[PDB]
Each structure stands twice: as structure tokens, then as C-alpha cells.
Amino acid sequence: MRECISIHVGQAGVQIGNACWELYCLEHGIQPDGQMPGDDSFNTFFSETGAGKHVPRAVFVDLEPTVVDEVRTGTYRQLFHPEQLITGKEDAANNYARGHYTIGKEIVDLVLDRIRKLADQCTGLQGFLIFHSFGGGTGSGFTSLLMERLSVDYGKKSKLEFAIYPAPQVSTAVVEPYNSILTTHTTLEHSDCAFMVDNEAIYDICRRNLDIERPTYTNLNRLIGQIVSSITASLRFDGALNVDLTEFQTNLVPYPRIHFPLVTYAPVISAEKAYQLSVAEITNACFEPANQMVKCDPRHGKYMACCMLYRGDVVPKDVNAAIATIKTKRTIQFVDWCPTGFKVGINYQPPTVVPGGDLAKVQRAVCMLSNTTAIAEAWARLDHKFDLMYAKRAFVHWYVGEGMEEGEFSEAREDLAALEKDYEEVGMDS
Amino acid sequence: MRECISIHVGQAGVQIGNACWELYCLEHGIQPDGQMPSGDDSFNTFFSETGAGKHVPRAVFVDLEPTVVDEVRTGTYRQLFHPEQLITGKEDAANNYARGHYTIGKEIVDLVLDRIRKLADQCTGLQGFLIFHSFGGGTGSGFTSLLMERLSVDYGKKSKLEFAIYPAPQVSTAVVEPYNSILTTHTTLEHSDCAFMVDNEAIYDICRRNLDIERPTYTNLNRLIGQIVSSITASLRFDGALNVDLTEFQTNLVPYPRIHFPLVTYAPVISAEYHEQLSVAEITNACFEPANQMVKCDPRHGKYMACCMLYRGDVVPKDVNAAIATIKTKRTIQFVDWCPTGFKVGINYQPPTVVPGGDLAKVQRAVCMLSNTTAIAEAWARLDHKFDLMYAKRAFVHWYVGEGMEEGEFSEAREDLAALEKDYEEVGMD
Amino acid sequence: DMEVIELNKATSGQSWEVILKPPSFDGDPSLEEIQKKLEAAEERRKYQEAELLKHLAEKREHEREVIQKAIEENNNFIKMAKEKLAQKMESNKENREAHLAAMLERLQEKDKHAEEVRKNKELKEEASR
Amino acid sequence: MREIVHIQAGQCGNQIGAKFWEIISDEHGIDATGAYHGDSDLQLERINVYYNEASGGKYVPRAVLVDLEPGTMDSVRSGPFGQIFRPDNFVFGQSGAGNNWAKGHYTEGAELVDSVLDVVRKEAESCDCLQGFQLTHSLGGGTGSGMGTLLISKIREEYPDRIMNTYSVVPSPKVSDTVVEPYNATLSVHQLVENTDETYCIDNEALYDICFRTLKLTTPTFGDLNHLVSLTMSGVTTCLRFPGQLNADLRKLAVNMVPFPRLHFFMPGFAPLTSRGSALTVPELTQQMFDAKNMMAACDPRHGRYLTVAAIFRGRMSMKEVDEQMLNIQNKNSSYFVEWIPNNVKTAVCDIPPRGLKMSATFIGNSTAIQELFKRISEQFTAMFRRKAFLHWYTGEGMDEMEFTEAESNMNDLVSEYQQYQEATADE
Amino acid sequence: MREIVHIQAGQCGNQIGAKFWEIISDEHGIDATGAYHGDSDLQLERINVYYNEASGGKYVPRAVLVDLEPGTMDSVRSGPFGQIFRPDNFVFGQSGAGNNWAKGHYTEGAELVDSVLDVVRKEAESCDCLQGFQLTHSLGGGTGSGMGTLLISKIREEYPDRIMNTYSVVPSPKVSDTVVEPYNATLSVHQLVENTDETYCIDNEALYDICFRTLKLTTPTFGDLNHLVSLTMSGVTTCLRFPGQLNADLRKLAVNMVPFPRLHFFMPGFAPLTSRGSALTVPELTQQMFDAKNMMAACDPRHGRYLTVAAIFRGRMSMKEVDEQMLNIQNKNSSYFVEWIPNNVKTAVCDIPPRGLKMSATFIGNSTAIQELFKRISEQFTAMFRRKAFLHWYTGEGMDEMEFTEAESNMNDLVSEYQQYQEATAD
Ligand SMILES: Nc1nc2c(ncn2[C@@H]2O[C@H](COP(=O)(O)OP(=O)(O)OP(=O)(O)O)[C@@H](O)[C@H]2O)c(=O)[nH]1
Ligand SMILES: Nc1nc2c(ncn2[C@@H]2O[C@H](COP(=O)(O)OP(=O)(O)OP(=O)(O)O)[C@@H](O)[C@H]2O)c(=O)[nH]1
Ligand SMILES: Nc1nc2c(ncn2[C@@H]2O[C@H](COP(=O)(O)OP(=O)(O)O)[C@@H](O)[C@H]2O)c(=O)[nH]1
Ligand SMILES: Nc1nc2c(ncn2[C@@H]2O[C@H](COP(=O)(O)OP(=O)(O)O)[C@@H](O)[C@H]2O)c(=O)[nH]1
Ligand SMILES: [Mg+2]
Ligand SMILES: [Mg+2]
């Protein structure tokens, strides 16, 4: 029934997967060994064995074994069967060309075989959720290669991403703007919807809202897990209003290339303090830049679609009143070709927090997914960094040495230039 | 023996038949079970007799739907009729002449003709048929015209008389009744020998004015109609002297085959709730008053071609002649130049009978005037105008066309009623 | 001024004519036809029912064609994605092997030069003094 | 003309359908288990129009409940009268329609449509005299709109001589779920113009405005909207389920209401307007016939002319007073009725008032002002279609852009035909 | 990317190589017998990057010790940690290279090179996931320069897909053994430009100046110079040897550091500067990044621009304070970083300080100012080459004069390429 297969690629994808699957287990009452002492919608994300064991419909892939080895030997080592934790020997060395060609081609058939075995256990596969960074050699190059192979084996079956946008505060490589442009170009026609998460935005939310001086990946990933869990709560639970993979796509994507919704989340409260926000308060917080997962200014753009995903002690009457006050906000502008841009989903299950984490337990929370032309600001920042380096052909020899041609860089950059123009044209009045 | 077979078609025809046969039973001393504890033997023209001493109406009740006739099959008079003379289909004509004539009627017409032939086979001197129906209903209009056509083929030298309900908006069931009326008049014109039209608005107003009934129901209207029908058929069911056979109706009232619509006037109509008995002069004067007519029209705007006075009860010829002499003295009573100015008078000694517990009072003397006047063309003009308003736009025509009817039939039927209007005008010239 | 004329007298009735003034001026269907008309109406009703069903049959065909069209577009997408990826993986393979061959040929040329240097040292040494 | 087969499709179709069954069950004295515990003979006289008689005294709705998703079926089963429905009449898929007319009409809907037809066929074959079908659905979503219109044409093919009647919920930005509502609604109107005999236009724009403006509900919910729909549906079906002379069946109603085949979209009116958490004379009830505030379609009856009207009065009231007031309302408002359809207003009085009321009036109007509803959908449609926004979700299902242009043209022709009859005079 | 194979060639290469092995053994808690007697788990986490695990719990350096003369190898065997090395990994000749690049590269070196490849192949083939090779050697003598560059091209031929890394000691007239040092250094730079992925320029001119000027050692010895080299090598390999996110392997470091294939010569920086017989604050440590006095290559970082920098802080200090100080140092000195390589400075903090210190900072800089080092070698080279002085020392070994003109051109082109990127604007 309505299954979703999760694919976690590279260090970022795998570490965010650790946080997401830990949280899903807590939300569904699944112990680290796969046992659970009725809703039953969690079956979209967990298969079941004859012994009553619940297993994630997920594959964890990395070209180096170190990060996945922590899963294999950690608290949740019995949750996943060994065959769904796939690793090679040598990583992509922050190089898209090694992820896509040199190193990735050695492990791609094995990964596809494991996804085929997970798909064979689905009676109504909705599609794939792919978690990865834009910056790493595996997250960029192996994801692009995998997306292309998934289009060959599954055609148009839905493929949605959770992609980590690079930030210098926690950046691992100088060439991340190259890895991001190449992966966006290759992946554009194969992806149906991509939820970008800017590491600088999550870093600043951790410092500001949670009082964490120097946030680590553990702090960032637990907050990301909370957002991912909110986006997938409508699929893993059956609440007052549900939204599946298909409904996300239909309401958020007006044109195939315009598939990058802005994610906003509220409330983010520190475990300390000891001080509940109303539906109107958390709804108003969704249109404040400080709560966005991507740094950009929605006032410099126009909304084409807004999807509200509520969870916890939330009643439809209180949501409609909150959206009605949002509709009367002159500073929140919609494109003239959009008569109505609001898709609401409500789940009864309050946001669960990891015991000993940084987040406080709240009675109600909301995740807004909005298609705003303001997200083109993130592409512009990335494209500018690409141009500064590419004008000198700096670091290009690393990609060329792996069989890549300079023409692929020009094509990928020209494709992102067309994407920037597409956001400009789509935001224009009729 | 001068047997008459009655044919009650559709809801109006059947419900008026219930009222007529209830009244005939009361007038002849026939109980609801068909028994009569026994005047004269002339009641045999309307009732046959079975081996068990029961008296059975020479009648067929037909409807394209079973609901109305089912009340006859299970009601007070269920033993009066044999089941084979109560004929119903399953689905009605939905207020559509084309449906009753061309689609549905066509499948039950042979069964009805078979039953009529079985009643005719029991007659030694069959006079003809008395057909009760509405102009407005799909069965009353479409099935009646279809039946009249076959009756002309099977019984060429037999008289056919109608008691037809002219539509009134106060109790109207359909917007298309003017279409059904013109269509059925056109197809029935050459097959009918004499038709006594009853305008529901005239009877509705007599019930409100004369009987103090705020909102008259079909039960109130039909009991009044039953009195008029009984007055006209009295000389066939009793040993009377005027309108002794059915052919005498056309001889006394119809000088031209197309102008066969006599105006019926009746008096007195008094409420069951002390009153001094009305004299012969009083009830005769009431004969010349538009408020007592069965059809709304102005006899002053026309000319008489024939007048038949049917007195009933305590009435002496001397008083009738004195009453007619005073009327000629104060009133014009214009006759057409080819017919003589005068009256054919009949006195039936049998007293007026009323249903016990009905709305009408028992009176000592009553009179029914049947006059062929050109003023009845006003009723056709009102109907033709409503037809024209709708037909100019082809409103509702698709319902008839969808049943196999052609638009040309609407033009032909309307052209035939335009010729009928001109006939009344030419006949009333000098 | 009224001429009365007796007409009939019977058990429960009596009739006569009263004349006020004399007048101013002295003085086939067939079963076949019916059946023909009813059958012609039935054929028009059956003809419009058949036209309606003919149009609904055309809608069913269109429905099958749109399902087929979506299937064919998904198949063309698969075919194109497959050959674009086979072309990209093979071009990259040729390029990576060309760069690797060129850099090994440079190292091999250094070895040829080294044995040529060794040969000159050998003729300078011994074939002297 | 005895039995009606009811079908409810998608979320909206199933919510207003469950509410219809609960109001008419209360009026007919039928409890949640299908047992009759009333005290009037009028309640059972025509019970078989909507209910079958099952083993031992129980009555079961002749209803088929349809969706491409199970959640809606579960919520109806769990609802107050959920157990009254025949369990095997719940037909549902697992995938959903993704708010997409094309998925409901051609892809997922086509995969479930034969399972639905097998259940409605079983109900139909069991009928002594099937009148036709009544469908409740929305036009703005995927299942009710796409699959509901697919079901209509399939049912038209197998039952061409039966009446096809719909209660169609028109979308509004004031109560909106998805961005592609104007597309789904235009594609459905194209289907309804060609394949239904009678369609009641239930406008969410009008229902929202009644709750906000008249009922003073600052934040109306679907419960508040569906309370007006359930009273309206009880009112419009009155003559089908109680003894009476006028419009007693679906075909006699269509013959009285539909002068031109395409002009079969009705504007329902209702008085009094009430909220779920709690007066009225005959002259007051008759006045509401021309009140835009009492219309369930967001059109002003004074902006056009009535081609035909069915007026239904319920409760203990004088038939004489109703007759006098209905004549006065027509004579005083002669400019709002076409003069070339004489006696185009038919009135009926029923002793049984709707649930929760003592007196009511319901108007089934065939007004040329309904073109305002179609123009509103059309302007929202062109604003999106002009930029081809969201078109890939429909063309990705195998549809051609030509279907959109055709549906848009047919709907604009419908507007232009209402305008033609609105301006027509008796003297051509 | 786990194991590194270390090779040390010639006198200089073996002296700095022995010192590298004793500093990192102390930091990893490994005694002279290869036994682990540490205390921290971070010490053993990545111990296999540099050490093999031999019979019993002992760790043996994956090091090959090479020389054309036996003396330095005997002194290495006799030195502190001499017994830790695998005895069969000592590969030595008897003749020597007479401080002549040609003898090491073509004559004596070519006769010993297959014995060396025997031993490095055994080490490399035993690796689960070989990163590549690191060579310590001088550029001014014969064995380290000539045979060391010969070994690089032979090892490259057999392992073309592995990273080749060097710690190359540049000669200076301030501590000179031979008049021909400019020739040996130019012939080696020509080889390094074409065959290494990363080269750390350890300048004896800079080492001598730190000892003389800052440490006040009137007459510095190799022991004094080598103490600075051992602290620098401990600092630059910190991210290869301890758990961490940044530049954790030779290839990720090269991808972050090398924007143009030829510009792979690094200027190492270190703070604090100490003698063998001698804690700074975070702001003090970050300032030394632009201090010519703290550079291990005799170049002023303010004379050029940094293409890329890896900054490594060691000891117990606030990561927040390091982050704030590193941002301030680049915002206040924006003109010394190329604007067309965004976010070109990557910082790492390690809890374990180098041996003998409580807090330290190491800078791996890819600076255009390194052209001052190459210009200095080039001016010395041309002053000799213009008169063909000592040329019969190289032509006597079979060399042609053309190799000199080619090496000189290649090195001057390298200078001209650093100058080109130094002047380039974002525009
Ligand atoms: N939010 C978040 N970002 C991460 C995490 N790990 C790495 N990143 C980011 O991802 C980028 C580096 O890519 P990685 O995912 O580590 O690399 P990889 O996919 O493993 O690729 P290779 O190691 O080159 O084979 C940088 O922008 C990091 O800041 C993590 O756990 N959480
Ligand atoms: N006087 C009188 N008129 C009636 C009665 N019943 C119906 N009518 C009138 O007849 C017309 C409607 O035709 P009906 O006779 O009911 O219809 P039908 O012949 O059964 O035809 P379908 O129902 O269409 O098949 C309207 O003008 C009614 O007012 C009745 O009992 N008495
Ligand atoms: N009146 C009313 N409108 C509803 C209800 N539920 C949804 N809608 C409307 O129906 C449309 C969405 O269609 P929906 O029936 O939910 O989708 P489906 O399941 O794909 O048929 C929008 O116009 C909603 O405003 C309801 O219970 N009542
Ligand atoms: N820093 C440093 N430089 C050295 C050392 N030994 C020799 N040198 C330098 O290395 C060069 C001579 O090369 P050397 O290694 O002794 O000759 P090889 O045995 O032929 O490689 C000159 O520049 C010396 O100053 C040492 O231990 N440390
Ligand atoms: Mg990695
Ligand atoms: Mg009838």
C-alpha cells in the first residue's frame, strides 16, 4: 500500500537518514530492534517480516565505508538488514566526476539491485525520496548517476529529493559550487520535486533559536530530521487531511523545471526556557525569513503555491482563520496567474523529539512548503561562485582528469542560467 | 339494448371514472360489491351482469403507470370491477404526448383493444364509447389519440364521445400541457363525434365560490364533474326522452363534424352546509350565466347553433316553458342564421343524487344545458397562444423529437387548430 | 310567440322542442397507415439512440488512446534516458583512458631517454685514459 | 419510475452524500441500524425510491460509495449513519487521484471504474422500475470530478434511457484545497453539458458567503457549508420521496425544468438560512426566491431571468396562502421570468418539514443568471491556461492541450446560450 | 583511502624522515619497540594510515629507507626509534651519489632503484586501500634529489591513480654542502612540476633564518633546522592521522589545495617557533599566517596572494574563538587572497597538540609568493649556467645540455604562471 522508498546518498544523506529513521521509530513505537508492542500507515515506510519485525524501506549508500559503518555497528544495527547498507572502498574525493563516473560506476548496479528488491516488495509504490548533499563527490555525482538509472528502470515514477545546499560555515570543499551546478544540470529532467536545505539557515536557527554556540552535524541533522518527518507525516500517518507524493508535486510544481519549494518550519524552541504557541502564531512564523530552511527574501519574489503541513493539537477551523489573515497580507505577494495557492494537511500526532535532544516538546507545529520565485536567489549565489572559479578554469583539471569534458561545465552553467531566467519569466505579470 | 362502453385514460380519466361510477352505483342502487337488492332496467346499458347476480361496469380503466389504478384494485369498489378491465403499464408518459403516443402507448394498445373487444362482444346493440381523459398529461393526450385512431378502424359506424379536461395553471402538472393539448386535439379531431370539455379553472372557481372550499382538491373537482357526467348520461341509463341514444348527441348538438365541442352549464351547485329550494325559473336563469359554465368563455361574443336543456327531478313542462319565455324577453340569445332560435328540452324524473358526505347538497331539481356555441373558440385561442409563445423558441420540443416525433407534427397540429379557429369564425358569420 | 313541439314521452322522461324564431336562412383511416407512421417514429427514436451510442463509443476509443499515449511517452523517455547515459558513460571512459595512456607514454619516453643517458656515461667511462 | 440509484465519489461527494443519507433517514424515521421507528405513513409511502428492504424490517440505502483513496470510506463508515450502508457497496482504490482530473478520468479512475459499475449494475438489475442515477461529487478535485464524469459517461452508455442527475460542488478560492481547481472544474463542466439531464450547482463560493455574511460565522468549516447542502438536498428531493402530484420523478422534473438540452444547470435556493447551533411566514418564504443571499450558486437571480422554477414549501402552512403569495411574487417580478414560457413556476406543498425546521421553502431555478457562475470559472481557467501553468500534470497523463481548448469553448458557448435566451423577447 | 607508503631518500631525506617517525610515534603513544602505551582512543583511530600491525600488538612504520651510501642509514638504525623500522625496508648502496643529481637519477640510482621498488611494491600491495606515497628528500644533493625524483616517476608508472606527495628540502647558500646545489635543485623542480600532486617546500634559507634571527642560535646545526621540520610535518599531517572532516586524505587535500596542476608547491607556516631546548592565544596564532618569520619557505606571504589555505589548530582551545579569528584574519587581509576562489581557507581544530607544545597553528598555503623561492633558485642557476660552470659533472654522467635549458624553462614558466594568477582580477 502506497509505499515510499528512501535512498540516502553520501555522508550528508546517510547522517540525515540516521536522524530521520531514529525519529520515525520513536513516532511509531518501533524499538531499535525493529519490534513494536491502530493507524498502520507507517507500512508506507516500513515493511514487515514473518517474525513481526518492521524494516525501513530504505537503502543507505556511500562510496567510503566509514559513515555507514556507524549504522552497521550503532543502536539501530538490527533495524536494517545488512544488504540495504551499501558501501565501496574509496570515496569520490569531493569530485562529481568520481561519483558519477570513475568510482560510482563500480557500485551503481549493486545499489539498483537492492532498490529493485525493495520495489518488488511494494504493491503500490508512490516513488523515491533521495537524500544527499549538493557539495560532496558522492552526494553530487553518485546521486546524478542514480537518478538517471532510476529514470531508465522506473520511467516517470515520482522521484523527490532532500538536498543539502552548501554553506561555508560547515563546507568541506572549495569545489562545492561546481559539484552543485553539475548535479543540478544532470538531475533537473529526472527529478520531480527537490526540497533544498541550506546548511547556513539551519546553522543560524541552531545558534539563534536553540542557543547553540557552535552547532555540529548532530545538532543540524536532528533539526533536519524534524522537517523531513513533518513532510513525511502525511504519508506515514492518517490525519484530518492527508497529502501524498502526487499531491505534493501537483500543488507545488507549475512547470517541470520549477520544482524547488522553500521549506519553513515552526516552532523551534530550546529544550531549556520552560515557556504554548497558537495555530495563528506558528502560521505567521512560516512567512518570517528567520524560520526558512534556505536563505532568500520572499518579499523580493512571488508565491506560486503554498502547502501547509500541520501536526499535533490543530483544528481545521483554527487553520482556516490563520490562512485567511495570511491572504490579506499585501507583503505576501502571489503571481497573477494563480487564483488559489493553499494546500492544507493536518495530522493529529504532535512533533516528537529525540530524548536528550536540543528541541523542546511542543503541542503543535507546522511545515510550510512554498514555491516562491525568491528561491532563485540561492541559485544566483551558487552560480556566481561557479563563474568566479570557472573564468580561470580553477580546479577543472580534477574533473577533466576523470574523463569529463569542459563542454559539460558550459552546458550545466547554461542550464542554470536558463533556470534563473525561468524564475524571472514565471514571476512576471500576464 | 343500447350499451355504452366507458374508457378511462390516465390519472384524470381514471379518477373522474371513480367519481362517475360511484355516483351511477348510488343512482341505480348498486352496492360497492356489485350487488343490487332489487325503477327500470335501462342501467343495463352501463352495467353487465354475472352468474352470481353481480352488476359490472362496461368500462376499461387504463394508465401507463400503476399507482392510480392500484387504488381502484385495492379500494372500496375493488369487487365492482374484474381485474382484466383495470390495465396498467409500468412507466408513465412523463407529461409528454410523443412518449404516450409513439413510445410507451404502442406497447399496451393491443391489450386495451383486446379488452374493449371482449366488452363489445357482450353488447347486442353497442352504441359506442365514452372516453375520459386529460388534454395535459402524456397518457391522457398521447395514449387517447392513439386509442381513438384504432377505435375508428375497428368500429367505423360507432359513436365516440369525450369528456376532456382542459388545463388550468391552478392545478396544472406540467409546463408543456399546451403542446399536449394541441397535439391530441389535432390527432383526435376526425375520430371524435362530440367532446365535452371541462376547464379545471371553471370547476376550481365553482368549488371556491359555490361550495366555500378554500383550496379545492381533485376529490372536490371530480365529484362536481361526476354530477355533470351523470346529468348527460342519465337518459341512456334510465328510460328518458331526450339524448336516448349516442347518435342523438351529434344530431342534437353537432351540425358540422369539426365544431363538436358543446359548452356545458350546470345548476344549482349548493354547499352541503338551511336553504329554500330553487325554482325552475331560478335554475334556468342560472343556465345563462357565465359563472356556472364548465369552460371559461363569453357566450355574448358568440352565437348558438344548438341548445339542449336536461332537467332532472321535480320539474313540470309548464314551468320550463314559462322560464324560457322570460329569458327570451330580457336576453338576446343570438343563434346562427341557418339554425332556428330555440331549445330541445328533456326532463328526467330521477332526482339529482349526491354522494353521502360529499360537498354538494341534495337538491329537488337541477338542470344541465349543453349548447354548441362559437364562443368556445376563446378556450382554443388561449391554448393556441400559449403554444405559440413556447413554439416560437422551440422550447421543450427536444423532448418530443427525442421520442421519434418530427417538428412538422407541431406545425401541422397548430395549423389544424388555426383552421378550427377560422371554422368557428366562418360558422358564426351571419 | 313560441312554437312548442312534442318529441318523446317515456317511463322516466318527457321531451319537446321550443321554437322562438325559425332560421333566417332556410337550409376513413387504415391500420396500415397507422402502423407505417408508428414504425417511422420508432426508427427515428432508434436512430438517435444509435447516434448517441456511436459518440460514446468514440469517447471510449479516445480514452484508450490517451492511456496508450502516456504509456508511449514514458517508453520514449526511458529509451532516450538510456541512450544518453550509455553515450555519456562511454565518452567518459574513452577520455579517462586517453589521459591515462598519454601520461604513461610520457613516463615510458623518460625510460628510453634514461637508457640513452646510461649509454653515454658508459662510453665516456672506460673509453678514456 | 420508482428506484433511484445514488453514487457518491471522492472526498466532497462522500461527505455531502453521507449528510444527505443522515437527513433523509431522520425525516423518514429510519435509525442508524436501518430500523423504522417513525409515526407517519407518509414516511414509508415512497421509501423504496431511495431504500431497499433487507432481511427483517430493515431499510438499506441504494447507495454506492466510491473513492480512489480508503481514508474517505473509513471516515464515512465511522460517521453517525456509517453502519446503514451496504458493506459491499463501498468501492475504493488505494492510489488516489492527486487532485488531478486527468488521473481520475483516464488513469487511476479507469482502473477502478469496472469495480464501481459492477456494484451499480447489481443495484440497477434489482430495480422493478429504475428512474435513473443521482451522483454527488465536487468538480475541483480529481476523483469526484474526473472519475465521477467518467462514471457518468459509462452509465450513459449502459443506461441511455435513464435520467442522469448530479449534485455538483463548484470550487471557490474562499474554500480551496488545490491550485488546479479551475482546470478540474472546466474539464468536468464540458462532460456535464453533454452527459447529464439535470445538474444542481452547489457553489462553495455561495455557501461560504452565506455562513460568513448571513450566519455571522467568522471562520466557516465544511461542517457549516454541508449543513446548508444537506438542507438544500432534502428540499430539492422532497417530491421524489413523499406523495404528491408535481415533479414526482426525475423525468417529469426534467420535462418541467429543461426547455433546451444543454440548459440543465439549476440554481438552488433555500429559506430559512440556519447554522448548526440554532419565525418565518409564507410571504417571507416566497420573497427569498429572488434573494441572492438565499442562493446556493453564487449568482444573483435579478441579474437574469428564470426559464423555469419548481417551488417547494414544507411544514404546516395554508396551501391557499402559498398559492396567493406565489402568484403575487410572479406578477410583481414579471421582468425576472421569460414571458415566452407561460406558467413556468410550479409549486408543491409538503406537510413534513426538513429536519430541524418547522417551515421551509426550496427553489429549483433554471435561471439565465447561472452564466455568472460559469464566467467566474472561465476567467480563473484562462488566467492559468494563458500561461500553460500546471499543464504538464495533465499532458503527462496522456491528455492533449486540445481537450482544454475544447472544454473552455463548450463552457463559453453555454454562457453565450444562456445570454441568448436572457435577451430573447416574445415578439421575434 | 587508508594507507600511506612513506619513502625517505639520501642524507637529508633520512634525517628528516627519522625525525617525522619519532614525533608522530610520540603523538600516537608508540614507543621505540612499536608497542602502544597511549591513553587516548584518538591515537589509534587512524593509526593504520602510517603503521602496519605486526606479530603481537606491535606497530611498524610503513616506511622504506633509501640511500646510495650506508652511513646515514647506520645512524638512523642507531638513533631514537631506529629499531622501530622493518629491517628489510632499509635499502642501501655502497657508492654514493657525490652530491650530483645525474648520478642519483641516471647512474648509481638506476642501479639501486629495482631493490627499492621490490620493497615499496610489497608495502603498497599489502594495503586494503592505498592513498599514495610520501617522500622526504633534499633537492640540493644527489640521492634525495636525483634518485628521489627517479623513484617518483617509477612509482607513478606503476601506481598512476595514487597521490604522490613530497617534503622537499630547498638548498640555500646559508647552509650549503656544494657549489652545484642550484643545478640539482632546478633538475629536481622540473621533475616535481610534472610528476607530483603536492609538494611542501621546506626551505633551508627560511629554517636557517628562523634559528639565527628568532631562536638566536649563532651557529645553527641540522638538528636545530630539523626540529622546525619535524614540528611542521607533524602539523601538516594532522588531518591524515586523526579523526576529522576536512582534508582527511591525500586526494581530498589536493582537490582543496590545487586549482592548477602545476601550482602544487606549498608554503608551510608554523606557530609557535621553538628551539630543541626552549602557550600562545588563538588571536596570536591566527596572526602568524601572514608573518614571513613563521614561514618554512623563504617567501613573504604579503608579497603575493593565497590561492588556497588549510589552517590547522592543535591543543585545547575554543572552536568558536578559532572560527571568529579566522574570519577576522581574512576580512582584514582580503587583498592577500584571490577573490576568484571563494571560501578558499579551510580550518580544522585537533585536541592533540604536537609533541612538546600545548597549543599550535600550522598553515598549508598555496601562495603566489612561492615564486620568490623559485626566482632565487633560478638566479643562482643562471649565474652558473651562463658560463657552463660544472657542466662536465652532469655531461660526464651521460646528460645533455638540453636537459638543463628545459629544466630552467619549466621553472621560469612556473614563476610566470604564479605571477599571472597573482595579478588576475575577478573583473
Ligand atoms: N546538514 C548536513 N550537512 C552535511 C552533513 N555531512 C556533510 N554535510 C555537507 O555535505 C557537503 C559535503 O558532502 P558530503 O555529503 O560529506 O560528501 P559525500 O557525499 O560523502 O562525498 P565524498 O566524500 O566526496 O565521496 C558539505 O556541504 C557538508 O557541510 C551532515 O551530516 N549534515
Ligand atoms: N379534474 C381533474 N383533473 C385532473 C385530475 N388528475 C389530473 N388532472 C389534470 O390532468 C393534467 C395532467 O394529466 P394527468 O391525467 O394527470 O396525466 P396522465 O394522463 O396520467 O399522463 P402521464 O402521467 O404523463 O403518463 C393536469 O391538467 C391536471 O390538473 C383529476 O383527478 N381531476
Ligand atoms: N461543500 C464541500 N466542499 C468540499 C468538501 N470537501 C471538499 N470540498 C471541495 O471539493 C474540492 C476538492 O475536491 P475533493 O472532493 O476533496 O477531491 P476528490 O477526492 O479528488 O474528489 C474543493 O473545491 C473543496 O472545497 C465538503 O465536505 N463540502
Ligand atoms: N634541513 C636539512 N637539510 C639537510 C640535511 N642534510 C642535508 N641537508 C641539505 O641537503 C642538501 C644536500 O643533500 P643531501 O641530502 O645531504 O645529499 P644526498 O644524500 O645526495 O641526498 C643541502 O641543501 C643540505 O643543506 C638535514 O638533516 N636537514
Ligand atoms: Mg564522503
Ligand atoms: Mg399519470
Author numbering:
A (entry chain C): 1 to 37, 45 to 282, 285 to 439
B (entry chain A): 1 to 38, 45 to 279, 282 to 438
C (entry chain E): 5 to 31, 44 to 145
D (entry chain B): 1 to 278, 283 to 432
E (entry chain D): 1 to 278, 283 to 431
Pull verbatim passages from the article behind this deposition.
GTP tubulin is known to assume a curved conformation in solution and a straight conformation when integrated in the MT lattice. Here, we modified our original method for the preparation of human α1β3 tubulin to purify Drosophila α1β1 tubulin. We first determined the crystal structure of Drosophila WT tubulin within T2R, a complex composed of two tubulin heterodimers and one stathmin-like domain of the RB3 protein.
Based on this assumption, we expected that the residue substitution Y222F may produce a stronger bias toward the “out” conformation in the T5 loop, leading to rapid MT nucleation. In the case of the Y222F mutant, the T5 loop was “out” with bound GTP (note that we did not succeed in obtaining crystals of Y222F with bound GMPCPP), but was poorly defined in the electron density maps in the GDP state. Therefore, the Y222F mutation destabilized the T5 loop “in” conformation, but in the absence of GTP, it did not force this loop into the “out” conformation. In short, the Y222F mutation gave a bias in the structural equilibrium of the T5 loop toward the “out” conformation, as we aimed for. Notably, 16% of the Y222F(GDP) oligomers were nearly straight (sampling time, 30 min), which is comparable to the probability observed for the WT(GTP) oligomers and well above that of straight WT(GDP) oligomers. Given that the T5 loop in Y222F(GDP) was not anchored in the “in” conformation, this implies a possibility that Y222F(GDP) tubulin nucleates MTs. Indeed, incubating Y222F(GDP) tubulin in the condition of the turbidimetry assay led to a signal that slowly increased over time. At 2 h after the onset of the reaction, using darkfield microscopy, we observed Y222F(GDP) MTs, which were substantially longer and fewer in number than the Y222F(GTP) MTs. Y222F(GDP) tubulin capable of nucleation was also capable of elongation, although at a rate lower than that of Y222F(GTP) or WT(GTP) tubulin. Although GTP is required for canonical nucleation under natural conditions, the straight oligomers obtained with the mutated tubulin partially complemented the lack of γ-phosphate.
